[PDB]
Structures are given as C-alpha cells and as structure tokens.
Amino acid sequence: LKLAIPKGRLEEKVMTYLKKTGVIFERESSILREGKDIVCFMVRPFDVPTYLVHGVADIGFCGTDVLLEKETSLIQPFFIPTNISRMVLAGPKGRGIPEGEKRIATKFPNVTQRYCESKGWHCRIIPLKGSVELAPIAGLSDLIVDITETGRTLKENNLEILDEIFVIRTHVVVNPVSYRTKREEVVSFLEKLQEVIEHD
Amino acid sequence: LKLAIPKGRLEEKVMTYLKKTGVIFERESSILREGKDIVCFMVRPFDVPTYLVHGVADIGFCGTDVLLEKETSLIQPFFIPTNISRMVLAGPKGRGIPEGEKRIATKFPNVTQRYCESKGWHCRIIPLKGSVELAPIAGLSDLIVDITETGRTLKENNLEILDEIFVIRTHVVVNPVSYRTKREEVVSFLEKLQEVIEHDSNE
C-alpha cells in the first residue's frame, strides 16, 4: 500500500498511528519512508489529494480545509477525532460586517466563495498565500476567511471572529480506484488504523 | 511610501537595501515594519503583486519566478543584478524525456506551460505546493520544473538538470497609480535605492 502523509504539524501523530498498526520502515528520508508492504510519501498537506487523484497513493491523511477547498470525490472512511483548528470569518473589532460587497482575503477562495453564496453575500475574493491577517490592517480587504487555532493571531491584530464556518480535523481518505482493485488489503489496514484511533 | 516586501529567500537582501538607503524602523512586527515616511508590509512573495495591483502598496519586490508565473501590468524602474537561483527542467538522471505526453510536476504551472509551448510538447501538468523533487521517484511525474540554487537537492535525489529555463533574480515593481499620485516622492526614493542596490550587488 502507498500512503500520502501530510508533512508538518501532524506528521508524527500519523506516523505513530501507522507504527501502532504494526508498520516497519527499512529506509527513511525527509520525503519518503518505505518498508515491507508500505510506502509513505511525505508531501505538503494540499498535495495529499493530488497524489491520490493521480493514483500514486492508495490512502492519505489531510485536513477538512484541504478537502473542502479542493473538491475531491475521494472515499472518506473516517477521521481522527482531535479538533485541531477552525475555519472562521474574521474582521476588525467592532467594524462588524461591511454593507454591500464584502472584500475578503483568504488562502481558501473556493471555501470563501461557497460561504458567501450560503450567506447570500456579494463578495470580492482576494486570494493570498499566507499572513492573511495583514489584509485588513493594510486596507486590502474588509474581512478574512482563515484558520484559527488559539485565536492569538486574530486577537493580537485586533480582529474578532464574526462566524465559525467549520471545524478542522485530519480525515483518512482513500483513492476510489485502489478501493476497488485492492479492496481487501485497504479495508484490512483501515480496520487496524481505526482500532488504534479509537483506543488512542 | 508603502512597500510590499517578500518574506523568505529575498527578505534579507531587500531589507538590507532599505537599511542602506537610510530607512530606520521605530516599530516592527512579523507582518508590518513602520518607519518615518515608510511602512513595510511583509508578505509572501506571490502576494507582492497582489498588494500593488490592488493599490495598497506603492513599491514592491519579488523574484523572477513570481513575475513570470503571474503576469501583471506593474512597472519595473530598474534592474537588480544578483542571480539568486535558476528555474530548471529536471528528471531522473539517464532517463531523458518521454516521446509522448510529458507528465511534469511543478509549483509553477504557467511557467511550465509556457516552456512546453516553446518546445511544441504535449504536457500533463501537475501542480504541487512543495517537495516537487519527490514526484518522479513516486511515479507522479516524468519530469519537474523547479527552482535550484546549487543543484544539491536535485543531485541527492538522483534528478539531473535537463534544461535551464531562466535565471531568477530580485525585481523592483511599482504600482502605476503611485507613479501618478506620488510621482516625485517615488522617483526620488527609487534614485537613492538604485544607487545603493548597484553598489551592493556589484561591489
């Protein structure tokens, strides 16, 4: 089986679960870990689905944010329970929500467009790659749609949460092709993983 | 003046240029550096042109990769010499280029598409966010289009440089409206900065 593991924050958590399912690696690097019957590609979280989409990985792990931003159609067996963070709408304290068309800066433009549609809002979406809290300070946007964990970044920049869009957790996702061709092998790894997750 | 400064690789070269032009900051945060007559927005490299195009910044700096990957109408007043890195086409050493459709992984899909057209190649372009050197060994792509400085990461992953697409440098870019509204202040700051930058890059 080939797995796409999100490098960064959750690497070690997921790697320990794999180990608890009983996996052994023969060689490891910053981007690849192989052993008997298991290969882990250590990729950026947003690339997890692209490694599955393209059929190079059978199973992957990645957050709710990745999946909602990039419409996948991946098999979603279950997820890891820990509430790691939240996708929120935020804006300058007391400014409330601007009348008319809202200028919103975000690293998640699809998520924001669907959010704006759901509220019935006219929005002008300004995609950024990082440090999204600077947009309101600089006059680039009125609001932001971004991830918050402790709320420090928002609080420290005089931004307040105006709406909670969704909680972010690490989902287990399966390539639909591998689910059909390697059915029994996938279900077997997945059962062991779900046991470790429950127990943990 | 409001400057949009690229975090990461080019951050110290640019901040050192401003330091030598006479800029002194009284207050500094991760995202905002304030000084007499100057505010610096510290942003991701690909966001520099966004801050300028929207008109919230007057002058910005970004590498050739940003500039060629995302076309803008911004003005480049002058040339900043230093070669930082290179954009290359790379693949498994010894393999070459497949004769049919080429699967290329990259963080720069427009640059890669432009490269393919310049070759008359039919390409299947796979966008990635980083660790692009893993694509060929995972079977995700035949080739990659990525940045290298010394070739180390490529070399240690058994990827060879098949072609040099362009040399990457720092560029200065100006919001065209700011050139209207703050004409003499901009022109004057750009004069001091080119003097400093020239001396630094050459000597």
Side-chain angles (χ1 to χ4, degrees), chain B residues 109-121:
Chain B
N110 297 326
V111 158
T112 169
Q113 167 71 20
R114 195 172 299 115
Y115 181 73
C116 296
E117 287 156 13
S118 88
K119 240 70 182 145
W121 290 352

Side-chain angles (χ1 to χ4, degrees), chain A residues 73-89:
Chain A
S73 100
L74 289 165
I75 293 183
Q76 300 214 25
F78 47 83
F79 57 91
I80 299 172
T82 316
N83 297 358
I84 58 213
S85 63
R86 289 176 319 181
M87 182 75 68
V88 299
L89 172 88

Side-chain angles (χ1 to χ4, degrees), chain B residues 64-65 68-69 85-88 111 164-168:
Chain B
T64 318
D65 49 321
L68 263 8
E69 178 63 23
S85 50
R86 293 167 281 161
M87 181 73 77
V88 298
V111 158
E164 305 271 347
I165 303 173
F166 56 80
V167 164
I168 291 157

Side-chain angles (χ1 to χ4, degrees), chain B residues 3-156:
Chain B
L3 271 51
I5 314 310
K7 299 225 259 274
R9 188 74 182 67
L10 306 179
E11 189 186 326
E12 57 91 8
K13 291 278 200 175
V14 173
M15 301 292 295
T16 288
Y17 302 138
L18 303 188
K19 185 196 178 188
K20 307 177 171 174
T21 74
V23 183
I24 288 166
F25 299 112
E26 163 71 293
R27 179 158 137 153
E28 295 174 88
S29 76
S30 190
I31 67 178
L32 184 72
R33 321 295 187 82
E34 322 169 52
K36 159 197 309 202
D37 307 343
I38 180 184
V39 167
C40 287
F41 300 132
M42 312 295 310
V43 303
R44 303 306 318 169
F46 264 87
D47 294 335
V48 161
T50 301
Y51 274 65
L52 292 157
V53 176
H54 279 77
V56 299
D58 296 307
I59 297 157
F61 308 83
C62 56
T64 318
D65 49 321
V66 172
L67 244 46
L68 263 8
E69 178 63 23
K70 165 178 185 173
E71 221 67 2
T72 65
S73 50
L74 314 163
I75 293 160
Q76 288 190 48
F78 61 87
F79 183 95
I80 303 171
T82 321
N83 294 332
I84 314 300
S85 50
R86 293 167 281 161
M87 181 73 77
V88 298
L89 175 71
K93 202 202 269 186
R95 207 182 297 165
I97 322 287
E99 283 193 323
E101 173 186 64
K102 300 132 172 75
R103 297 182 313 154
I104 313 179
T106 179
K107 304 198 275 195
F108 314 98
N110 297 326
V111 158
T112 169
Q113 167 71 20
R114 195 172 299 115
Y115 181 73
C116 296
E117 287 156 13
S118 88
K119 240 70 182 145
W121 290 352
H122 284 82
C123 293
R124 198 71 139 54
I125 303 172
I126 303 173
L128 289 181
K129 309 264 84 205
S131 295
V132 184
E133 73 278 353
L134 174 59
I137 290 164
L140 194 242
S141 75
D142 295 292
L143 304 163
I144 64 177
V145 163
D146 201 8
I147 298 174
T148 184
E149 295 200 23
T150 64
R152 169 201 214 263
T153 315
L154 297 177
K155 223 295 284 158
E156 86 197 74

Side-chain angles (χ1 to χ4, degrees), chain A residues 17 21 61 78 172 189-197:
Chain A
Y17 285 157
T21 70
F61 299 75
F78 47 83
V172 174
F189 166 77
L190 294 175
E191 291 173 339
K192 306 176 179 171
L193 177 60
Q194 202 167 224
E195 299 164 15
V196 166
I197 294 172

Side-chain angles (χ1 to χ4, degrees), chain A residues 31-32 41-44 46-47 50-51 54 56 124 126-131 133-135 137-140 157, chain B residues 7 31-32 41-44 46-47 50-51 54 56 124 126-131 133-135 138-140 157:
Chain A
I31 62 183
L32 181 73
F41 305 119
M42 319 301 279
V43 299
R44 308 313 307 299
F46 265 75
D47 297 333
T50 110
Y51 270 72
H54 280 88
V56 308
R124 171 86 166 300
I126 298 155
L128 297 164
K129 304 287 187 192
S131 288
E133 73 279 0
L134 177 68
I137 281 43
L140 181 56
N157 292 289
Chain B
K7 299 225 259 274
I31 67 178
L32 184 72
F41 300 132
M42 312 295 310
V43 303
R44 303 306 318 169
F46 264 87
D47 294 335
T50 301
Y51 274 65
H54 279 77
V56 299
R124 198 71 139 54
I126 303 173
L128 289 181
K129 309 264 84 205
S131 295
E133 73 278 353
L134 174 59
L140 194 242
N157 288 278

